[PDB]
């Protein structure tokens, strides 16, 4: 139905990804939601824990997949998740990577964000719909943050 569960999750994911991309692209606003406060903290924390690997994958991605960043990104996301139990940590890694892309892009030029956020929303809100719901939605992410 209109604004079903999948729709609400997709929209929420989309705007969370638009926030983090903005956050990494030199924009400074208070977090628009609790989930955004959580992601900004956890995604940047994960970046510092692996800065060279994310920066290296990001540069390679930009230098290889300029033709269509979206379809490469879909593959990257699948490989970030891998074959094991999915978890909020894996989800965070998706945001981290895309935020590093966004910042490296701005150091070089400028706006693929619109493309990137939708691609994230389609993958998590669409493909991984079942895991997201099973794990409480973005509310469950906020709980994961308030105990991490």
Author numbering: 1 to 110, 113 to 150
What does the primary publication say about this deposited structure?
NRZ is a 19 kDa protein expressed in the epiboly of the extra-maternal yolk syncytial layer (YSL) of zebrafish eggs. In vivo, NRZ has been shown to be a potent inhibitor of apoptosis after serum withdrawal, and controls development during somatogenesis and gastrulation. Similar to other pro-survival Bcl-2 proteins, NRZ adopts a conserved Bcl-2-like fold consisting of eight α-helices that form a globular helical bundle. Our findings suggest that NRZ is a unique pro-survival Bcl-2 protein with an unusual pro-apoptotic Bcl-2 binding profile unlike its counterparts in mammalian systems.
To determine the structural basis of NRZ interaction with BH3 motifs of pro-apoptotic Bcl-2 proteins, we determined the crystal structures of apo-NRZ and its complexed holo form bound to the BH3-motif of zBad. Helices α2-5 form the canonical hydrophobic ligand binding groove observed in other Bcl-2 family proteins that is utilized to accommodate the zBad BH3 peptide. Surprisingly, our structural search and comparison using DALI48 revealed that the closest structural homolog of NRZ is in fact Mcl-155 with an R.M.S.D value of 1.7 Å over 136 Cα atoms, and a sequence identity of 15%. In summary, like other pro-survival Bcl-2 protein structures solved to-date, NRZ adopts a Bcl-2 like fold and its most closely related structural homologs are the cellular apoptosis inhibitor Mcl-1 and the canarypox viral Bcl-2 protein CNP058. Comparison of the backbone structures of NRZ and NRZ: zBad BH3 complex. a Cartoon representation of apo NRZ (light blue) superimposed onto NRZ: zBad BH3 complex (green). Here we examined the structure and interactions of NRZ by determining the structures of apo-NRZ and its complex with zBad BH3, the orthologue of mammalian Bad and measuring the binding affinities for BH3-motifs. The structures revealed the conformational changes in NRZ after binding of BH3 motif ligand and provide a structural basis for NRZ mediated apoptosis inhibition.
